[PDB]
Structure formats: C-alpha cells, structure tokens
mmCIF file with all atom_site columns, C-alpha atoms (C1' of nucleotides) and ligand atoms in Angstrom:
data_model
loop_
_atom_site.group_PDB
_atom_site.id
_atom_site.type_symbol
_atom_site.label_atom_id
_atom_site.label_alt_id
_atom_site.label_comp_id
_atom_site.label_asym_id
_atom_site.label_entity_id
_atom_site.label_seq_id
_atom_site.pdbx_PDB_ins_code
_atom_site.Cartn_x
_atom_site.Cartn_y
_atom_site.Cartn_z
_atom_site.occupancy
_atom_site.B_iso_or_equiv
_atom_site.pdbx_formal_charge
_atom_site.auth_seq_id
_atom_site.auth_comp_id
_atom_site.auth_asym_id
_atom_site.auth_atom_id
_atom_site.pdbx_PDB_model_num
ATOM   1   C  CA    . UNK A 1 1   ? 133.400 91.594  111.066 1.00 0.00 ? 1   UNK A CA    1
ATOM   2   C  CA    . UNK A 1 2   ? 134.901 88.708  109.100 1.00 0.00 ? 2   UNK A CA    1
ATOM   3   C  CA    . UNK A 1 3   ? 133.878 86.527  106.166 1.00 0.00 ? 3   UNK A CA    1
ATOM   4   C  CA    . UNK A 1 4   ? 131.948 83.349  106.906 1.00 0.00 ? 4   UNK A CA    1
ATOM   5   C  CA    . UNK A 1 5   ? 133.295 81.011  104.225 1.00 0.00 ? 5   UNK A CA    1
ATOM   6   C  CA    . UNK A 1 6   ? 130.696 78.327  104.934 1.00 0.00 ? 6   UNK A CA    1
ATOM   7   C  CA    . UNK A 1 7   ? 127.943 80.334  103.302 1.00 0.00 ? 7   UNK A CA    1
ATOM   8   C  CA    . UNK A 1 8   ? 126.011 80.952  100.107 1.00 0.00 ? 8   UNK A CA    1
ATOM   9   C  CA    . UNK A 1 9   ? 126.513 84.060  97.972  1.00 0.00 ? 9   UNK A CA    1
ATOM   10  C  CA    . UNK A 1 10  ? 124.034 85.442  95.436  1.00 0.00 ? 10  UNK A CA    1
ATOM   11  C  CA    . UNK A 1 11  ? 124.183 88.032  92.678  1.00 0.00 ? 11  UNK A CA    1
ATOM   12  C  CA    . UNK A 1 12  ? 122.373 89.206  89.572  1.00 0.00 ? 12  UNK A CA    1
ATOM   13  C  CA    . UNK A 1 13  ? 123.551 89.437  85.994  1.00 0.00 ? 13  UNK A CA    1
ATOM   14  C  CA    . UNK A 1 14  ? 121.799 92.331  84.275  1.00 0.00 ? 14  UNK A CA    1
ATOM   15  C  CA    . UNK A 1 15  ? 121.631 93.418  80.674  1.00 0.00 ? 15  UNK A CA    1
ATOM   16  C  CA    . UNK A 1 16  ? 120.455 96.909  81.428  1.00 0.00 ? 16  UNK A CA    1
ATOM   17  C  CA    . UNK A 1 17  ? 118.520 98.343  84.376  1.00 0.00 ? 17  UNK A CA    1
ATOM   18  C  CA    . UNK A 1 18  ? 115.686 97.742  83.750  1.00 0.00 ? 18  UNK A CA    1
ATOM   19  C  CA    . UNK A 1 19  ? 116.621 94.918  81.434  1.00 0.00 ? 19  UNK A CA    1
ATOM   20  C  CA    . UNK A 1 20  ? 117.144 91.168  81.258  1.00 0.00 ? 20  UNK A CA    1
ATOM   21  C  CA    . UNK A 1 21  ? 117.686 89.709  84.725  1.00 0.00 ? 21  UNK A CA    1
ATOM   22  C  CA    . UNK A 1 22  ? 119.310 86.473  85.734  1.00 0.00 ? 22  UNK A CA    1
ATOM   23  C  CA    . UNK A 1 23  ? 120.778 85.355  89.039  1.00 0.00 ? 23  UNK A CA    1
ATOM   24  C  CA    . UNK A 1 24  ? 122.587 82.542  90.762  1.00 0.00 ? 24  UNK A CA    1
ATOM   25  C  CA    . UNK A 1 25  ? 123.648 81.287  94.161  1.00 0.00 ? 25  UNK A CA    1
ATOM   26  C  CA    . UNK A 1 26  ? 127.101 79.826  94.702  1.00 0.00 ? 26  UNK A CA    1
ATOM   27  C  CA    . UNK A 1 27  ? 129.120 78.279  97.510  1.00 0.00 ? 27  UNK A CA    1
ATOM   28  C  CA    . UNK A 1 28  ? 131.158 81.187  98.904  1.00 0.00 ? 28  UNK A CA    1
ATOM   29  C  CA    . UNK A 1 29  ? 134.166 78.960  99.491  1.00 0.00 ? 29  UNK A CA    1
ATOM   30  C  CA    . UNK A 1 30  ? 134.209 76.682  96.454  1.00 0.00 ? 30  UNK A CA    1
ATOM   31  C  CA    . UNK A 1 31  ? 132.297 78.643  93.831  1.00 0.00 ? 31  UNK A CA    1
ATOM   32  C  CA    . UNK A 1 32  ? 130.059 75.654  93.135  1.00 0.00 ? 32  UNK A CA    1
ATOM   33  C  CA    . UNK A 1 33  ? 126.891 76.891  91.471  1.00 0.00 ? 33  UNK A CA    1
ATOM   34  C  CA    . UNK A 1 34  ? 123.997 75.714  93.635  1.00 0.00 ? 34  UNK A CA    1
ATOM   35  C  CA    . UNK A 1 35  ? 121.082 77.315  91.788  1.00 0.00 ? 35  UNK A CA    1
ATOM   36  C  CA    . UNK A 1 36  ? 120.482 79.566  88.782  1.00 0.00 ? 36  UNK A CA    1
ATOM   37  C  CA    . UNK A 1 37  ? 117.511 81.413  87.328  1.00 0.00 ? 37  UNK A CA    1
ATOM   38  C  CA    . UNK A 1 38  ? 117.488 81.633  83.553  1.00 0.00 ? 38  UNK A CA    1
ATOM   39  C  CA    . UNK A 1 39  ? 117.114 85.123  81.965  1.00 0.00 ? 39  UNK A CA    1
ATOM   40  C  CA    . UNK A 1 40  ? 113.870 86.941  82.776  1.00 0.00 ? 40  UNK A CA    1
ATOM   41  C  CA    . UNK A 1 41  ? 113.133 89.218  79.844  1.00 0.00 ? 41  UNK A CA    1
ATOM   42  C  CA    . UNK A 1 42  ? 112.665 92.436  81.854  1.00 0.00 ? 42  UNK A CA    1
ATOM   43  C  CA    . UNK A 1 43  ? 113.092 93.421  85.491  1.00 0.00 ? 43  UNK A CA    1
ATOM   44  C  CA    . UNK A 1 44  ? 115.164 95.722  87.658  1.00 0.00 ? 44  UNK A CA    1
ATOM   45  C  CA    . UNK A 1 45  ? 118.452 94.745  89.215  1.00 0.00 ? 45  UNK A CA    1
ATOM   46  C  CA    . UNK A 1 46  ? 116.871 95.270  92.638  1.00 0.00 ? 46  UNK A CA    1
ATOM   47  C  CA    . UNK A 1 47  ? 114.032 92.872  91.830  1.00 0.00 ? 47  UNK A CA    1
ATOM   48  C  CA    . UNK A 1 48  ? 116.570 90.280  90.718  1.00 0.00 ? 48  UNK A CA    1
ATOM   49  C  CA    . UNK A 1 49  ? 118.600 90.669  93.908  1.00 0.00 ? 49  UNK A CA    1
ATOM   50  C  CA    . UNK A 1 50  ? 115.409 90.217  95.978  1.00 0.00 ? 50  UNK A CA    1
ATOM   51  C  CA    . UNK A 1 51  ? 114.477 87.056  94.028  1.00 0.00 ? 51  UNK A CA    1
ATOM   52  C  CA    . UNK A 1 52  ? 118.011 85.706  94.437  1.00 0.00 ? 52  UNK A CA    1
ATOM   53  C  CA    . UNK A 1 53  ? 117.931 86.010  98.233  1.00 0.00 ? 53  UNK A CA    1
ATOM   54  C  CA    . UNK A 1 54  ? 114.483 84.426  98.509  1.00 0.00 ? 54  UNK A CA    1
ATOM   55  C  CA    . UNK A 1 55  ? 115.517 81.600  96.177  1.00 0.00 ? 55  UNK A CA    1
ATOM   56  C  CA    . UNK A 1 56  ? 118.507 81.098  98.473  1.00 0.00 ? 56  UNK A CA    1
ATOM   57  C  CA    . UNK A 1 57  ? 116.271 80.977  101.534 1.00 0.00 ? 57  UNK A CA    1
ATOM   58  C  CA    . UNK A 1 58  ? 114.050 78.376  99.852  1.00 0.00 ? 58  UNK A CA    1
ATOM   59  C  CA    . UNK A 1 59  ? 117.057 76.323  98.763  1.00 0.00 ? 59  UNK A CA    1
ATOM   60  C  CA    . UNK A 1 60  ? 118.667 76.347  102.207 1.00 0.00 ? 60  UNK A CA    1
ATOM   61  C  CA    . UNK A 1 61  ? 115.405 75.557  104.006 1.00 0.00 ? 61  UNK A CA    1
ATOM   62  C  CA    . UNK A 1 62  ? 114.785 72.553  101.712 1.00 0.00 ? 62  UNK A CA    1
ATOM   63  C  CA    . UNK A 1 63  ? 118.241 71.223  102.568 1.00 0.00 ? 63  UNK A CA    1
ATOM   64  C  CA    . UNK A 1 64  ? 117.858 72.085  106.254 1.00 0.00 ? 64  UNK A CA    1
ATOM   65  C  CA    . UNK A 1 65  ? 121.088 74.088  106.031 1.00 0.00 ? 65  UNK A CA    1
ATOM   66  C  CA    . UNK A 1 66  ? 122.062 76.690  108.623 1.00 0.00 ? 66  UNK A CA    1
ATOM   67  C  CA    . UNK A 1 67  ? 124.530 78.495  106.312 1.00 0.00 ? 67  UNK A CA    1
ATOM   68  C  CA    . UNK A 1 68  ? 124.087 82.264  105.955 1.00 0.00 ? 68  UNK A CA    1
ATOM   69  C  CA    . UNK A 1 69  ? 123.431 84.058  102.675 1.00 0.00 ? 69  UNK A CA    1
ATOM   70  C  CA    . UNK A 1 70  ? 125.576 86.947  101.431 1.00 0.00 ? 70  UNK A CA    1
ATOM   71  C  CA    . UNK A 1 71  ? 124.109 89.616  99.160  1.00 0.00 ? 71  UNK A CA    1
ATOM   72  C  CA    . UNK A 1 72  ? 125.786 92.796  97.941  1.00 0.00 ? 72  UNK A CA    1
ATOM   73  C  CA    . UNK A 1 73  ? 122.408 94.530  97.734  1.00 0.00 ? 73  UNK A CA    1
ATOM   74  C  CA    . UNK A 1 74  ? 121.474 96.527  100.842 1.00 0.00 ? 74  UNK A CA    1
ATOM   75  C  CA    . UNK A 1 75  ? 118.155 97.337  99.141  1.00 0.00 ? 75  UNK A CA    1
ATOM   76  C  CA    . UNK A 1 76  ? 117.271 93.701  98.512  1.00 0.00 ? 76  UNK A CA    1
ATOM   77  C  CA    . UNK A 1 77  ? 118.297 92.713  102.031 1.00 0.00 ? 77  UNK A CA    1
ATOM   78  C  CA    . UNK A 1 78  ? 115.920 95.369  103.385 1.00 0.00 ? 78  UNK A CA    1
ATOM   79  C  CA    . UNK A 1 79  ? 113.097 94.211  101.122 1.00 0.00 ? 79  UNK A CA    1
ATOM   80  C  CA    . UNK A 1 80  ? 113.497 90.620  102.299 1.00 0.00 ? 80  UNK A CA    1
ATOM   81  C  CA    . UNK A 1 81  ? 113.606 91.607  105.964 1.00 0.00 ? 81  UNK A CA    1
ATOM   82  C  CA    . UNK A 1 82  ? 110.565 93.847  105.453 1.00 0.00 ? 82  UNK A CA    1
ATOM   83  C  CA    . UNK A 1 83  ? 108.850 91.037  103.534 1.00 0.00 ? 83  UNK A CA    1
ATOM   84  C  CA    . UNK A 1 84  ? 107.975 93.711  100.969 1.00 0.00 ? 84  UNK A CA    1
ATOM   85  C  CA    . UNK A 1 85  ? 109.658 94.462  97.626  1.00 0.00 ? 85  UNK A CA    1
ATOM   86  C  CA    . UNK A 1 86  ? 109.272 98.223  97.230  1.00 0.00 ? 86  UNK A CA    1
ATOM   87  C  CA    . UNK A 1 87  ? 109.887 98.269  93.477  1.00 0.00 ? 87  UNK A CA    1
ATOM   88  C  CA    . UNK A 1 88  ? 108.560 101.042 91.251  1.00 0.00 ? 88  UNK A CA    1
ATOM   89  C  CA    . UNK A 1 89  ? 108.683 99.018  88.017  1.00 0.00 ? 89  UNK A CA    1
ATOM   90  C  CA    . UNK A 1 90  ? 105.466 99.438  86.051  1.00 0.00 ? 90  UNK A CA    1
ATOM   91  C  CA    . UNK A 1 91  ? 103.174 96.409  85.966  1.00 0.00 ? 91  UNK A CA    1
ATOM   92  C  CA    . UNK A 1 92  ? 102.310 95.591  82.353  1.00 0.00 ? 92  UNK A CA    1
ATOM   93  C  CA    . UNK A 1 93  ? 102.353 92.568  80.033  1.00 0.00 ? 93  UNK A CA    1
ATOM   94  C  CA    . UNK A 1 94  ? 106.067 93.089  79.477  1.00 0.00 ? 94  UNK A CA    1
ATOM   95  C  CA    . UNK A 1 95  ? 106.901 93.037  83.190  1.00 0.00 ? 95  UNK A CA    1
ATOM   96  C  CA    . UNK A 1 96  ? 104.371 90.346  84.072  1.00 0.00 ? 96  UNK A CA    1
ATOM   97  C  CA    . UNK A 1 97  ? 106.920 87.564  84.659  1.00 0.00 ? 97  UNK A CA    1
ATOM   98  C  CA    . UNK A 1 98  ? 109.241 89.486  86.976  1.00 0.00 ? 98  UNK A CA    1
ATOM   99  C  CA    . UNK A 1 99  ? 106.274 90.743  88.980  1.00 0.00 ? 99  UNK A CA    1
ATOM   100 C  CA    . UNK A 1 100 ? 104.806 87.244  89.188  1.00 0.00 ? 100 UNK A CA    1
ATOM   101 C  CA    . UNK A 1 101 ? 108.097 86.011  90.653  1.00 0.00 ? 101 UNK A CA    1
ATOM   102 C  CA    . UNK A 1 102 ? 108.369 88.940  93.068  1.00 0.00 ? 102 UNK A CA    1
ATOM   103 C  CA    . UNK A 1 103 ? 104.766 88.532  94.201  1.00 0.00 ? 103 UNK A CA    1
ATOM   104 C  CA    . UNK A 1 104 ? 105.388 84.816  94.768  1.00 0.00 ? 104 UNK A CA    1
ATOM   105 C  CA    . UNK A 1 105 ? 108.609 85.491  96.671  1.00 0.00 ? 105 UNK A CA    1
ATOM   106 C  CA    . UNK A 1 106 ? 106.742 87.907  98.938  1.00 0.00 ? 106 UNK A CA    1
ATOM   107 C  CA    . UNK A 1 107 ? 104.035 85.316  99.404  1.00 0.00 ? 107 UNK A CA    1
ATOM   108 C  CA    . UNK A 1 108 ? 106.674 82.777  100.409 1.00 0.00 ? 108 UNK A CA    1
ATOM   109 C  CA    . UNK A 1 109 ? 108.212 85.162  102.944 1.00 0.00 ? 109 UNK A CA    1
ATOM   110 C  CA    . UNK A 1 110 ? 104.808 85.930  104.445 1.00 0.00 ? 110 UNK A CA    1
ATOM   111 C  CA    . UNK A 1 111 ? 103.946 82.236  104.878 1.00 0.00 ? 111 UNK A CA    1
ATOM   112 C  CA    . UNK A 1 112 ? 107.241 80.710  106.048 1.00 0.00 ? 112 UNK A CA    1
ATOM   113 C  CA    . UNK A 1 113 ? 109.840 81.051  108.769 1.00 0.00 ? 113 UNK A CA    1
ATOM   114 C  CA    . UNK A 1 114 ? 113.575 80.638  108.187 1.00 0.00 ? 114 UNK A CA    1
ATOM   115 C  CA    . UNK A 1 115 ? 116.771 80.442  110.207 1.00 0.00 ? 115 UNK A CA    1
ATOM   116 C  CA    . UNK A 1 116 ? 119.191 81.733  107.588 1.00 0.00 ? 116 UNK A CA    1
ATOM   117 C  CA    . UNK A 1 117 ? 121.154 84.846  108.523 1.00 0.00 ? 117 UNK A CA    1
ATOM   118 C  CA    . UNK A 1 118 ? 121.125 87.342  105.622 1.00 0.00 ? 118 UNK A CA    1
ATOM   119 C  CA    . UNK A 1 119 ? 124.411 89.219  105.567 1.00 0.00 ? 119 UNK A CA    1
ATOM   120 C  CA    . UNK A 1 120 ? 125.736 92.170  103.582 1.00 0.00 ? 120 UNK A CA    1
ATOM   121 C  CA    . UNK A 1 121 ? 128.755 91.275  101.438 1.00 0.00 ? 121 UNK A CA    1
ATOM   122 C  CA    . UNK A 1 122 ? 131.360 94.021  101.878 1.00 0.00 ? 122 UNK A CA    1
ATOM   123 C  CA    . UNK A 1 123 ? 132.867 94.509  98.417  1.00 0.00 ? 123 UNK A CA    1
ATOM   124 C  CA    . UNK A 1 124 ? 135.090 97.374  99.554  1.00 0.00 ? 124 UNK A CA    1
ATOM   125 C  CA    . UNK A 1 125 ? 136.615 95.066  102.174 1.00 0.00 ? 125 UNK A CA    1
ATOM   126 C  CA    . UNK A 1 126 ? 136.481 91.640  100.558 1.00 0.00 ? 126 UNK A CA    1
ATOM   127 C  CA    . UNK A 1 127 ? 136.511 92.116  96.808  1.00 0.00 ? 127 UNK A CA    1
ATOM   128 C  CA    . UNK A 1 128 ? 134.008 90.607  94.381  1.00 0.00 ? 128 UNK A CA    1
ATOM   129 C  CA    . UNK A 1 129 ? 131.077 88.592  95.664  1.00 0.00 ? 129 UNK A CA    1
ATOM   130 C  CA    . UNK A 1 130 ? 131.652 84.961  94.561  1.00 0.00 ? 130 UNK A CA    1
ATOM   131 C  CA    . UNK A 1 131 ? 128.440 84.885  92.489  1.00 0.00 ? 131 UNK A CA    1
ATOM   132 C  CA    . UNK A 1 132 ? 129.507 87.928  90.421  1.00 0.00 ? 132 UNK A CA    1
ATOM   133 C  CA    . UNK A 1 133 ? 128.805 87.575  86.703  1.00 0.00 ? 133 UNK A CA    1
ATOM   134 C  CA    . UNK A 1 134 ? 131.880 89.643  85.874  1.00 0.00 ? 134 UNK A CA    1
ATOM   135 C  "C1'" . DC  B 2 1   ? 118.606 103.644 85.261  1.00 0.00 ? 1   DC  B "C1'" 1
ATOM   136 C  "C1'" . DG  B 2 2   ? 116.452 102.034 90.472  1.00 0.00 ? 2   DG  B "C1'" 1
ATOM   137 C  "C1'" . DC  B 2 3   ? 116.643 102.274 94.936  1.00 0.00 ? 3   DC  B "C1'" 1
ATOM   138 C  "C1'" . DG  B 2 4   ? 116.758 104.372 100.295 1.00 0.00 ? 4   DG  B "C1'" 1
ATOM   139 C  "C1'" . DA  B 2 5   ? 117.808 108.383 102.543 1.00 0.00 ? 5   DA  B "C1'" 1
ATOM   140 C  "C1'" . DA  B 2 6   ? 117.830 113.036 102.817 1.00 0.00 ? 6   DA  B "C1'" 1
ATOM   141 C  "C1'" . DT  B 2 7   ? 116.265 117.262 101.538 1.00 0.00 ? 7   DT  B "C1'" 1
ATOM   142 C  "C1'" . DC  B 2 8   ? 108.528 121.723 97.638  1.00 0.00 ? 8   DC  B "C1'" 1
ATOM   143 C  "C1'" . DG  B 2 9   ? 103.867 123.486 97.522  1.00 0.00 ? 9   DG  B "C1'" 1
ATOM   144 C  "C1'" . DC  B 2 10  ? 99.139  123.559 98.856  1.00 0.00 ? 10  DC  B "C1'" 1
ATOM   145 C  "C1'" . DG  B 2 11  ? 96.041  123.552 102.175 1.00 0.00 ? 11  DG  B "C1'" 1
ATOM   146 C  "C1'" . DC  C 3 1   ? 103.783 127.096 109.678 1.00 0.00 ? 1   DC  C "C1'" 1
ATOM   147 C  "C1'" . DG  C 3 2   ? 103.340 121.382 108.964 1.00 0.00 ? 2   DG  C "C1'" 1
ATOM   148 C  "C1'" . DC  C 3 3   ? 102.900 117.324 106.114 1.00 0.00 ? 3   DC  C "C1'" 1
ATOM   149 C  "C1'" . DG  C 3 4   ? 102.704 114.490 102.426 1.00 0.00 ? 4   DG  C "C1'" 1
ATOM   150 C  "C1'" . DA  C 3 5   ? 104.556 114.710 97.675  1.00 0.00 ? 5   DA  C "C1'" 1
ATOM   151 C  "C1'" . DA  C 3 6   ? 108.294 115.411 94.769  1.00 0.00 ? 6   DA  C "C1'" 1
ATOM   152 C  "C1'" . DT  C 3 7   ? 112.792 115.918 94.008  1.00 0.00 ? 7   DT  C "C1'" 1
ATOM   153 C  "C1'" . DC  C 3 8   ? 121.920 112.795 96.748  1.00 0.00 ? 8   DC  C "C1'" 1
ATOM   154 C  "C1'" . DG  C 3 9   ? 124.753 108.850 96.783  1.00 0.00 ? 9   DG  C "C1'" 1
ATOM   155 C  "C1'" . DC  C 3 10  ? 125.539 105.134 95.046  1.00 0.00 ? 10  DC  C "C1'" 1
ATOM   156 C  "C1'" . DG  C 3 11  ? 125.710 100.457 92.461  1.00 0.00 ? 11  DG  C "C1'" 1
HETATM 157 MG MG1   . MG  D 4 .   ? 124.291 92.862  91.934  1.00 0.00 ? 201 MG  D MG1   1
#
DNA sequence: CGCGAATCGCG
DNA sequence: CGCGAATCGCG
C-alpha cells in the first residue's frame, strides 16, 4: 500500500490525556492548513481524533471533494465507521463541551452519507502524519 | 492516561 | 461449567 498524496491528513494536539484537545486538517502534500479546532478545555485524545475525522468528512463533503482522509488513530477510524464514539470519559459540567461535539459528530454521521475513504496513516512506514503538532 | 483486543467470579 | 464483568499493547 502506498501514500495517496492528494489527500487530507488530521491529527490532535493534546495537553494531557485527558486534557486540552485541539485538532487540525492539512493538505497531505502541501501542508496547507484547511481547518482547525481551537482548544477544547478537556477531552481525550481519542475523542479529538474522532472529531477531527468527522470535521474532515464535513469539510470535504461541503467542497464536493473525493480526496481521502488519513488518520493515525485506529480507534477513531473504528468509531467513525461504527458511527459510535465508544469513549469512557465521564459526562459532567467540565466535559460538557467535548461531549456536545462528539454527540453532534455522531448525529452528523447518522444523518449523512459520504464518499470519502478513511485511511490509516502508517507512521512506522511513512514517518510523521502531516498534521502532527510536533 | 484511553482505547480495542485478549485474557474472573457468581449464578 | 458458561457468560458477562473486570482486568496487554500500544500511542
Ligand atoms: Mg494523534
């Protein structure tokens, strides 16, 4: 399997797990930042990776793009394909925002179709995913 | 730490 | 038993 350069790559920047979560989607070839989510005060890295893929799906659908999405998160890929984010993070006032976003992302997946292939980025083969926060 | 996958205890 | 609940490997 080889890299598809004409694609979008996503990744999360965490400050702790759980902790502050941000993410972005970038052009795999050029590194152009296509979308970003500002820091969410608490969430898990998995939740952020799930949100990043769904945001990518929404972005690509709006643009009618057929580009695939790369994620380095096998867990988040599974959650998206299952249309169910199996997170164990407690639901309280503190975690209300991340859960609101996850619930809405699930709702989007359950009420839309999409053409975008969702592919696993192979870090051991290909090095850092282009959206890495470093 | 949080995950999915793989590996006890009570009814 | 056998079955859900509770407890390695990675990133
Ligand atoms: Mg990540």
